[PDB]
From a paper:
The protease plays a crucial role in viral replication by cleaving the polyprotein into individual nonstructural proteins. The substrate binding pockets S1 to S4 in the HuNoV protease, which accommodates the P1 to P4 residues of the substrate, are in the cavity between the BII-CII loop (beta strands BII and CII, residue 102–117) and the DII, EII, and FII beta strands of the second beta-barrel.
To ascertain that similar conformational changes in the BII-CII loop occur in other GII-Pros in response to rupintrivir binding, we first determined the crystal structures of apo GII.4-Pro Sydney (2012 GII.4 variant) and GII.3-Pro to 2.4 Å and 2.6 Å, respectively, followed by their crystal structures in complex with rupintrivir to 2.5 Å and 2.71 Å resolution. In all GII-Pros, H115 is mutated to a glycine residue. As observed in the available crystal structures of GII.4-Pro, this H115G mutation results in the loss of this hydrogen bond, causing the BII-CII loop to adopt a closed conformation. This conformational change in the GII-Pro causes the sidechain of the conserved arginine-112 (R112) to orient closer to the active site. Isoleucine-109 and methionine-107 clash with rupintrivir’s P3 and P4 groups, respectively, while the P2 of rupintrivir primarily clashes with the R112 sidechain. In addition, the fluorine atom of the P2 sidechain causes steric clash with valine-114. Thus, loop opening is essential to accommodate the P2, P3, and P4 groups of rupintrivir.
Residue numbers in the entry:
A (entry chain B), B (entry chain C): -1 to 172
C (entry chain D): 3 to 123, 130 to 172
D (entry chain A): 3 to 125, 130 to 181
Write the structure that this text describes.
Amino acid sequence: GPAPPSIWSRIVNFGSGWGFWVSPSLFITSTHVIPQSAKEFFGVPIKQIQIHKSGEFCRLRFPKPIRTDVTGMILEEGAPEGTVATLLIKRPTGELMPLAARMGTHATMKIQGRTVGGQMGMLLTGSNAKSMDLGTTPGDCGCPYIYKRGNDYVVIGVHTAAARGGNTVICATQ
Amino acid sequence: GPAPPSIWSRIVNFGSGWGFWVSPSLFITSTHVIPQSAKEFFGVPIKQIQIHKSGEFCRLRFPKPIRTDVTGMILEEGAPEGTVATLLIKRPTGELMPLAARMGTHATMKIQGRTVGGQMGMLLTGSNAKSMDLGTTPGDCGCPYIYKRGNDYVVIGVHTAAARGGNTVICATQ
Amino acid sequence: PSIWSRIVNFGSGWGFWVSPSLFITSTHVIPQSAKEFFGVPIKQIQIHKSGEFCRLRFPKPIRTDVTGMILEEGAPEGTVATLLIKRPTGELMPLAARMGTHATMKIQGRTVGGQMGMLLTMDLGTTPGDCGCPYIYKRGNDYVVIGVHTAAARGGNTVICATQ
Amino acid sequence: PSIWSRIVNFGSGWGFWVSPSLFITSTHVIPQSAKEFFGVPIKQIQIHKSGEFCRLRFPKPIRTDVTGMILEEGAPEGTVATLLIKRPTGELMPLAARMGTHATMKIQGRTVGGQMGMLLTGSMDLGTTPGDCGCPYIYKRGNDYVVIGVHTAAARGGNTVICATQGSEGEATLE
């Protein structure tokens, strides 16, 4: 098992994609996945939420605990070079997909014509970054990148882009 | 103000579509949007959940309340013929779309190659049923049909099918 | 893009981007204490008012993401159009409205002219804040805009869509 | 039509529907108390055991939903195939494995044969488990996935793996 169920339960639908409950009050997602026409997130009006955007990484701090079931989790500003992280994808079908990804340097690139920055990852699934069965889909944005630092699990960011050419994905960081 | 924010909050993403919290433990949705591969619905394993499927209408009663923020609501089998209900669509962008729908007879259709049943509904939008901006999309299935009987709101079913070429829609009931 | 993105908050109500340079709205929704619309001095905006139908032709294209829509002066009598109401709650509300003859009526102590419509639609009624929202129907494959919401008779059944 | 749906539990492990009527799995995963497989008596099933590879051709199509797929005896050396692991947790884990020479591996006093490979994850827990035996190895040729065998064993370190194929290929005897 690459990810305990206590970590899969933290991944929940948000807007056009997903997001991750780092802590009962902290929630990370991709900026372009945010539902920009919504007036509330998880029952809290927007004005009450501390929204901090670092590129396409988005951090939401809620005034009161939203997910009491989760515990506080370590958040690293990207993984160390060469770390084999796991992109924990949830699909609308209910499928869980731990996609192994070798994390590389931080870079910026044009993906859809937009310029996306973040830590580069090279999917270790045998397919290109864009594959319904073996890779990512546009709807997977917001899903977390996790690795194991000693005995602890560490979120290094969230899925923000998948290059069409090969196995390159972008993990939005900090 | 067609529906108060307390009613829109009950509408939440579920699988390939949406669902509606009638009470803290009651959750209705469309059968064909259920995440079939998911072992857990809202953190609760599907084995502890009471699932009752009537046609393409699905009811789920959970062991312990999850949405303790919403009060119990009246759920009845369809609406009196001629009633002007509102299909309360949520979109991944966060937009809210209350589409007026004059409810008609209970009947069955051939939709997408499958046989579907429920209370028919003529959209009073002035546009087609499968319009992208002014009508329903396949991803709206599970959203509620709600009308107001006197001073009480009454949910009558969930959107399960939209006919091509006209304002006809299907509200799965029971 | 979505047609709703063409409906933007404007003054005390709304307005509709027909083309990247043409913006239709209701006059009684226009702000008074403002000499700039969407970032252009008024005197450099071509502003034409026909009763309560105001149109603003801008010097350069403000909304380059939108196509050019067909703006006709009302719909043929009996046509079922859609009033696209956007609400501050985030609610997008298409209301069916059968359009009829031209009408001049005293509503809210004010003589309003336009094309009359009859809404075919708990509270799915018009509010004062809706004024400026567009009336639109589909002719063949072409979405036609026929005017903007300018008035609503008491009872929420009869409405006036400013035109011309 | 997802390829993961072709992977289903079988005995103590998994197996893969190559076609509506063809099923492949690992030999040691098969239940020894076998009176029927997928509702078909064994006498009616055409069974081919090549070492740790087991092919079951059923008299009539069982999985009418799946389309015919190409089964090859291994992949070309250097091919980055994909081991499609299914877990009872619901996790679908595609693991990249660089495929190499055909080989036998010493394990449990015996020998297991197949095309060997090395997982691209190297040496957190993204490795195989014995319960994964029977899961398919695949690789994309052209625009079609090709199954090359099923997982049967991993070396002690868990990086070297054995993809059991239809069988070992020998040297031709000419004339």
